[PDB]
Structure 1
């Protein structure tokens, strides 16, 4: 697809590792509005992720909204996992 709609995106592949808290969010990475990858991440947290050509520091708020300086054509978007 080429219009982002997180309500219709299939859940990412994930593993809720037993040694750590269960992350609250799913993230989805797009290039030209085309899904490239997806996974889990913590709410109210931060991560460094390779987004196309760049390392990007991505912050999450309490509602799984993500912020970062994404390279042209790319975006990473969050949403709450079921039960969160």
Structure 2
């Protein structure tokens, strides 16, 4: 690799560098297994908790999105352009 060359990869949002959501596990209800993080053009908007193997309707910018979670907290939905909500399984769950 000679001097003056450049090299990078595509900039995939990395949840390992995200601080945890500022969550509150309400003691009256089951603890949700997942963290979610909402981004617009790779800029975090907010974050929270949700259930695994489940569903929710979430307002993502200008559009409601029906978000399904699998058992590993991967989140699927029809997100508007430039937006995404990404999940991860909480430590210990």
1:16-75 residue CA offsets vs partner (Å, 9 max, x unmatched): 011110000000000001111100000000001000000111000000000000000100
Show structure 1 runs of 4+ deviating over 3 A.
Answer: none
2:86 is the alignment partner of 1:72? no
RMSD across aligned positions (CA): 1.7
**Structure 2 CA distance for aligned equivalents of residues 2 and 15 of structure 1:** 31
Return 46-55 or 1-10, whichever deviates more: 1-10
Compare CA radii of gyration and give the structure with the larger one.
Answer: 2
Structure 2-normalised TM-score?
0.86
**CA contact 1:28–1:78 (8 Å) conserved in 2:** yes
Runs of 5+ in structure 1 lacking a partner?
Answer: none
Runs of 5+ in structure 2 lacking a partner?
Answer: 1-9
Instruction: Say which structure, 1 or 2, has more relative contact order (CA 8 Å, 6+ apart).
Output: 1
Aligned length: 84
